[PDB]
Amino acid sequence: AIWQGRSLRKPSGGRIVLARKKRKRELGREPSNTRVAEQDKRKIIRTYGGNKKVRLTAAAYANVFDKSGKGRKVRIIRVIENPANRQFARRNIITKGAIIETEIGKAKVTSRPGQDGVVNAILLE
Amino acid sequence: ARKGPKRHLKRLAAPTSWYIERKAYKWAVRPRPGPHNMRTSIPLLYIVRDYLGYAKTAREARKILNEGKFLVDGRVRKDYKFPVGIMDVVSIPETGEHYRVLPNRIGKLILHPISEEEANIKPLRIRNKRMVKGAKIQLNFHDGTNHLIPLSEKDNYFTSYTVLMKVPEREILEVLPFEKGAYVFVTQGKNVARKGRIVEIKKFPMGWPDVVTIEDEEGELFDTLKEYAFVVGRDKPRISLP
Amino acid sequence: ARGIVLEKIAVEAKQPNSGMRKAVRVQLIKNGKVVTAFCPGDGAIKFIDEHDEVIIEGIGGPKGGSMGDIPGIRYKVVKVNRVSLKELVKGRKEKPRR
Amino acid sequence: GDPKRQRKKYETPPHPWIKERLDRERVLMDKYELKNKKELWKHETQLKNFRRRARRLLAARGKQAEIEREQLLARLKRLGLLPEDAVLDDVLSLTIEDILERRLQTIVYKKGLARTMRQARQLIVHGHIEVNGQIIRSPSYLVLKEEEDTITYARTSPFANPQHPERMMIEKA
RNA sequence: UGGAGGUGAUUUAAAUG
RNA sequence: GGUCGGGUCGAGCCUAGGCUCCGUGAGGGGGGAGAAGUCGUAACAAGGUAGCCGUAGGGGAACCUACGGCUCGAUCACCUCCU
RNA sequence: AUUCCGGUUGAUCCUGCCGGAGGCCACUGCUAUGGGGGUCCGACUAAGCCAUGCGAGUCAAGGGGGCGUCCCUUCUGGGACGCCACCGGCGGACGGCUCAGUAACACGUCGGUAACCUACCCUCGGGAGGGGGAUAACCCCGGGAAACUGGGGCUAAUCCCCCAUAGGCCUGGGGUACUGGAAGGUCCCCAGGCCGAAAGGGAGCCGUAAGGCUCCGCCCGAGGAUGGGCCGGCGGCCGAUUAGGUAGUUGGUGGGGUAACGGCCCACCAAGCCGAAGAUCGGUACGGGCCGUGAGAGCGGGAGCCCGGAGAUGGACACUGAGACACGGGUCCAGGCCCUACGGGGCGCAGCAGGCGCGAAACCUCCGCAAUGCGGGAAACCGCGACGGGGGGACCCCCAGUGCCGUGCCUCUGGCACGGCUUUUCCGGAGUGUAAAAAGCUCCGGGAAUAAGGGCUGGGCAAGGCCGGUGGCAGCCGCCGCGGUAAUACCGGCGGCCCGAGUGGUGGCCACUAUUAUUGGGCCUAAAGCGGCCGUAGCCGGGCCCGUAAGUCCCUGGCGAAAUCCCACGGCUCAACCGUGGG
Numbered sequence A: 001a002i003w004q005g006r007s008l009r010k011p012s013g014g015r016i017v018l019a020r021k022k023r024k025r026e027l028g029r030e031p032s033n034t035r036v037a038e039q040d041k042r043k044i045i046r047t048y049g050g051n052k053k054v055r056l057t058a059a060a061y062a063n064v065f066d067k068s069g070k071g072r073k074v075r076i077i078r079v080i081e082n083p084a085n086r087q088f089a090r091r092n093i094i095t096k097g098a099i100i101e102t103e104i105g106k107a108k109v110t111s112r113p114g115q116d117g118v119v120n121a122i123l124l125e
Numbered sequence B: 001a002r003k004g005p006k007r008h009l010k011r012l013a014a015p016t017s018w019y020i021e022r023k024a025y026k027w028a029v030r031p032r033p034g035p036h037n038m039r040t041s042i043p044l045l046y047i048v049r050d051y052l053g054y055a056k057t058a059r060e061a062r063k064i065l066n067e068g069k070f071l072v073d074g075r076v077r078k079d080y081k082f083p084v085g086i087m088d089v090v091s092i093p094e095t096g097e098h099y100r101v102l103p104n105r106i107g108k109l110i111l112h113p114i115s116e117e118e119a120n121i122k123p124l125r126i127r128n129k130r131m132v133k134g135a136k137i138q139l140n141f142h143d144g145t146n147h148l149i150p151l152s153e154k155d156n157y158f159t160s161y162t163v164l165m166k167v168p169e170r171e172i173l174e175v176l177p178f179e180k181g182a183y184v185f186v187t188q189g190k191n192v193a194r195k196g197r198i199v200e201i202k203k204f205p206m207g208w209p210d211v212v213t214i215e216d217e218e219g220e221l222f223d224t225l226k227e228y229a230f231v232v233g234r235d236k237p238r239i240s241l242p
Numbered sequence C: 001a002r003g004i005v006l007e008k009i010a011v012e013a014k015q016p017n018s019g020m021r022k023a024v025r026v027q028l029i030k031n032g033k034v035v036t037a038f039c040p041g042d043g044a045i046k047f048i049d050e051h052d053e054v055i056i057e058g059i060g061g062p063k064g065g066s067m068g069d070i071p072g073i074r075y076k077v078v079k080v081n082r083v084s085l086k087e088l089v090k091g092r093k094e095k096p097r098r
Numbered sequence D: 001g002d003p004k005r006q007r008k009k010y011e012t013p014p015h016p017w018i019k020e021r022l023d024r025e026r027v028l029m030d031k032y033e034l035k036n037k038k039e040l041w042k043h044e045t046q047l048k049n050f051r052r053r054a055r056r057l058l059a060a061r062g063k064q065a066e067i068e069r070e071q072l073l074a075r076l077k078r079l080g081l082l083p084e085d086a087v088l089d090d091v092l093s094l095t096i097e098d099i100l101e102r103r104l105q106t107i108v109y110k111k112g113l114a115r116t117m118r119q120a121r122q123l124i125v126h127g128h129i130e131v132n133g134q135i136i137r138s139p140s141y142l143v144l145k146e147e148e149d150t151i152t153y154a155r156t157s158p159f160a161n162p163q164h165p166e167r168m169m170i171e172k173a
Numbered sequence E: 001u002g003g004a005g006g007u008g009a010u011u012u013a014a015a016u017g
Numbered sequence F: 001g002g003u004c005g006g007g008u009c010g011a012g013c014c015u016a017g018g019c020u021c022c023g024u025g026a027g028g029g030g031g032g033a034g035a036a037g038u039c040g041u042a043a044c045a046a047g048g049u050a051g052c053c054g055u056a057g058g059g060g061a062a063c064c065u066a067c068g069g070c071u072c073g074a075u076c077a078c079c080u081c082c083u
Numbered sequence G: 001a002u003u004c005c006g007g008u009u010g011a012u013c014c015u016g017c018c019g020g021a022g023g024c025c026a027c028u029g030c031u032a033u034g035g036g037g038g039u040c041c042g043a044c045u046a047a048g049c050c051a052u053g054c055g056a057g058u059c060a061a062g063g064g065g066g067c068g069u070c071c072c073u074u075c076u077g078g079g080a081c082g083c084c085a086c087c088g089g090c091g092g093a094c095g096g097c098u099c100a101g102u103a104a105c106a107c108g109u110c111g112g113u114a115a116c117c118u119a120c121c122c123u124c125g126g127g128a129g130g131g132g133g134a135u136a137a138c139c140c141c142g143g144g145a146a147a148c149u150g151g152g153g154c155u156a157a158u159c160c161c162c163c164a165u166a167g168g169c170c171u172g173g174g175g176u177a178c179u180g181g182a183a184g185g186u187c188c189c190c191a192g193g194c195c196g197a198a199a200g201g202g203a204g205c206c207g208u209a210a211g212g213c214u215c216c217g218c219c220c221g222a223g224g225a226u227g228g229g230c231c232g233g234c235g236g237c238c239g240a241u242u243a244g245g246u247a248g249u250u251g252g253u254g255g256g257g258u259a260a261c262g263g264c265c266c267a268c269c270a271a272g273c274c275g276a277a278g279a280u281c282g283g284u285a286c287g288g289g290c291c292g293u294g295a296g297a298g299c300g301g302g303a304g305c306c307c308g309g310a311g312a313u314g315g316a317c318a319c320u321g322a323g324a325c326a327c328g329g330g331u332c333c334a335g336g337c338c339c340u341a342c343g344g345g346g347c348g349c350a351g352c353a354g355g356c357g358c359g360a361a362a363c364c365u366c367c368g369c370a371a372u373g374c375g376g377g378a379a380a381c382c383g384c385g386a387c388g389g390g391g392g393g394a395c396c397c398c399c400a401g402u403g404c405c406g407u408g409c410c411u412c413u414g415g416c417a418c419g420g421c422u423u424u425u426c427c428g429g430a431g432u433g434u435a436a437a438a439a440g441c442u443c444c445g446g447g448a449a450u451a452a453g454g455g456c457u458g459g460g461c462a463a464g465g466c467c468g469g470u471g472g473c474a475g476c477c478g479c480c481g482c483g484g485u486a487a488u489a490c491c492g493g494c495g496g497c498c499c500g501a502g503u504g505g506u507g508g509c510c511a512c513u514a515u516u517a518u519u520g521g522g523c524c525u526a527a528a529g530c531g532g533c534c535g536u537a538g539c540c541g542g543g544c545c546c547g548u549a550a551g552u553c554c555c556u557g558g559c560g561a562a563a564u565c566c567c568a569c570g571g572c573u574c575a576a577c578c579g580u581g582g583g
């Protein structure tokens, strides 16, 4: 379905004719559009070589860090902005680099919730 | 290999360091993963059947192995696929003989007879060295094995040094540094199986490997890769070599 | 190649020779094309009949083509109903099914 | 690519009908009682190969060339084609007649074990001749100098009896 | 001895194997 | 695992548009062999009007004529330039 | 052998092409006694279609049962013993087959991963505490034409699920213990989170018992090994009667996704990227080691063996698993086909044999796991159309036979007559050989007995100026040329020549050919100097002095698998073939 193998175009602009079928080790997966919700929800993915990934689909809390090294677990109000996609903020989609507002103020997300399963942010002064 | 690991090996594609008749049969033994690498070792079946001649067929070689008659580095080995490599000791106690595995002047593996006393020690070149949990040091040797030392000893071991180890107890008894005036034995390359003393060491930028100049007994100087030079003594050999 | 005989013909030799060279028109099995083939030997044309199958091969002239006083013919008959024509012309063997 | 194909050990003439070559080869065939042309051609090729190695070694220099140079001389004197003090230039004066004189057929006839070349061939093929204790049935086998004098009747042969009727007729010659 | 150029002229008809 | 909503990906299928290819094809056109049914004699000797190139017009057919060019043109007389 | 010979004229010298003479490959006419060795035999057309049998299993020392023979007692039983299936574990992703697609990071070669995954194996450091659960087998009842498949009862595990601990991953703040050329890596201390182990199981003895003493095992962490993924530089076809091409296209910023880097995919911002040193498009084709030929420079090919790639009727797409989008496993569409009680259900030999079709073009529906190896098992072992052994075949190469000797006669090469000899080969036996057979090899008895063809005969080109037929008819002819009633050339007889278990025909590549020319060709009259000139890129460029060290030369480290080639020595009787060393 989602193939991540190679481009069908040469850098000169010419076309490429595929010489083999798609291999299983080349496939992607659906993106996790991590939403703000009242409750948390995550799932576990079995991956190449029999490994695991923790995929967060709905987030209600965040771990917020200061410049002094102290962290606090607080709840997420909403997404103020997200430079990754022009309409993520309207839909409350959380990714790395998004600006979120919490009970203790705005913060910038430093984690990849689709890969790690948690939301970590640095508190903005 | 279209979809999975290879498990077979044709005779014509066997490693060049084995003493084997390459056209007599279709198949060769595919060695099992283990201590050494493919270029520096040989399966034990060829030692029992082809080299020593204690068995004529594979079936009776396996019966000899399963009864526990062959020791490698002081430990019983029953797997006929077990890889036996450079500097190992092969022991037969029911006959009272011992050998060290060493490369030829042409790069082929041979058995060198040794004394019963010298059979208790194996020299191990230090391939890598790292920190490990609890802040201890792990030493990774050329035959793939490992050892632990306390943090207070960290200045007595570095890569390319050789450690003489008592087997099978695995107890250290001597450390031989890599420096000028040390005695070395070449294990790979064009100058394989030549031995001598270290004269100079040279280094280069961007990860190209370092090279050593060595003086032999008759007074000739030759170069090789540093990682091909295996320390065996201070100014005289500490093991018996041809 | 193998083919089926459609008719017998005769080709005049080129100047300054004189004589009639006996040949056949053959339709090839593999693609249906029709070609002319020479019948070598004295009296050889008498061993051929319409609807018979023949095996033909090159006549052997320069540049892989025709030869001698018969340009336009590029092939010659070698077998007739799976029997060697050379034998039939000499003897030693008989043409089957009458 | 293509795997190995086993190739002929002899070379054929570049033109089948040249009068002078035909006459020369007919004389050789009659004299040594060879069975066919290819047999003769085989020996010719052997000679050519020897010369081709000498021509290449004269114009060579280095360390492997010397080893090859002495190996060629040693092999040639082991077969009995050169004396013990020959040099490389002497390789270029060898003739086809030198090689044919080393055939087991010829040597059996030269020693006086048969009366004719044809009889020597039949004695070899039927198994009446031993070479250094071994029975060999190939008349074209080239005899080494070290074993030339240990060539006799087989110890199980009818001819190994000085009273055999056919042996007495051979001895009368 | 032998050569290279220029300008003038050319008195009917006459096919074929 | 069934039923419904939404998103998204997708072989196949249908219609139309444009190119491309094979198969037959009334009729038209030169090319090559054959051997002579026919009309003439254009090219070779000054071939009976020297031959040939470019362009243009004309004629059953080879061909003819006009302007400019070449010698890969015979004969005699005179003149010029050389060895 | 670093080669020539015939053909344009009444006769001559040239240019130039055609033919002859050599090697190798595929089909094929006629004809054939023996052995040995080898990497030979449905590749060319149809990656067309396939009846039947076989090509992947194994573990009883993981677990409850069924049944049988026996021992102690037995109302009942406990034991031991031996088969059966089921649950459970590992393997089935290798090996085998073919060359359709592909002009591409597919392949060769040198490097990189500090940007990654890895069941089985090796070393070292640690761990195995507490709970629960169903279900096959088995018994009751069944459905369906079949393929298949339903309900109730009962049961175990090294089966499955929870709790704890160990452990793992992400982010923020400090410290500097390690490797390395260089730390987004390793190690230590605080802090917020999320994920989250295990079978002390099995077998045998010393055990009165208690408990040891071995063997095979279970889980986590660090490193290696093995098998792979990804990336870069460089190298190897034809076409201009294809000149402009590209618009996720090229780069940037912010994310997602992946085992992992990446326009791999998105959102936003720019106008980039390739091209006459040939882009793009079209044609043909799996790449290499190697193979054919030639004095060499070169030219041509790349089925068979080894290494890499791809595919399983065509086109799409998933489940399990360490590894697959899986040839003898699953789904949809398309196209054929088989069985139906008509409701339904199944199958694609480019595995080994075997059949049909296509064609000029290719074998037995055999025997064995004894050897070499692979999977499983603690082991003894078991399975394997891989592999090994034979059967068929003018596949390639090596070594032989179809008689020998003496004395006479002839036309004296050779044939015939006498006298004698031999047994490779042939016929019948014993031994050895073999998994069993067969071949082969050593011996014994019989006996010259059982064994020669194909092409050519005017010149090139070795070999008849003889005889009988035919009469520009029939026929021959690579080329030049013969045949028109007195043919050395057609048909036949007798002679002769070449090669010989082979010898001729047809098609292809190299040579011939200095008719593709770097070595090494031509252009006044023979094919060929643009009608003339100016100039862009490219190629080619005057003398001296100083510097550099890219080209270039010399020395030395790491590489370019094996097989294939050359040499000596050694093992099969020698050889072909095979081994050990040098190149």
Ligand SMILES: [Mg+2]
Residues within 6 Å of the ligand: B207
């Ligand atoms: Mg490095």
Ligand SMILES: [Mg+2]
Residues within 6 Å of the ligand: D001, G302
């Ligand atoms: Mg190939």
Ligand SMILES: [Mg+2]
Residues within 6 Å of the ligand: F047
């Ligand atoms: Mg005229």
Ligand SMILES: [Mg+2]
Residues within 6 Å of the ligand: none
């Ligand atoms: Mg006129």
Ligand SMILES: [Mg+2]
Residues within 6 Å of the ligand: none
């Ligand atoms: Mg005129």
Ligand SMILES: [Mg+2]
Residues within 6 Å of the ligand: F058, F064, F065
């Ligand atoms: Mg006019």
Ligand SMILES: [Mg+2]
Residues within 6 Å of the ligand: G008
């Ligand atoms: Mg002429």
Ligand SMILES: [Mg+2]
Residues within 6 Å of the ligand: none
């Ligand atoms: Mg030619």
Ligand SMILES: [Mg+2]
Residues within 6 Å of the ligand: G042
């Ligand atoms: Mg086929």
Ligand SMILES: [Mg+2]
Residues within 6 Å of the ligand: G092
């Ligand atoms: Mg399978």
Ligand SMILES: [Mg+2]
Residues within 6 Å of the ligand: B002
């Ligand atoms: Mg496979």
Ligand SMILES: [Mg+2]
Residues within 6 Å of the ligand: none
């Ligand atoms: Mg293309």
Ligand SMILES: [Mg+2]
Residues within 6 Å of the ligand: G105
């Ligand atoms: Mg590459």
Ligand SMILES: [Mg+2]
Residues within 6 Å of the ligand: none
């Ligand atoms: Mg390229």
Ligand SMILES: [Mg+2]
Residues within 6 Å of the ligand: G196
């Ligand atoms: Mg847990």
Ligand SMILES: [Mg+2]
Residues within 6 Å of the ligand: none
């Ligand atoms: Mg990223």
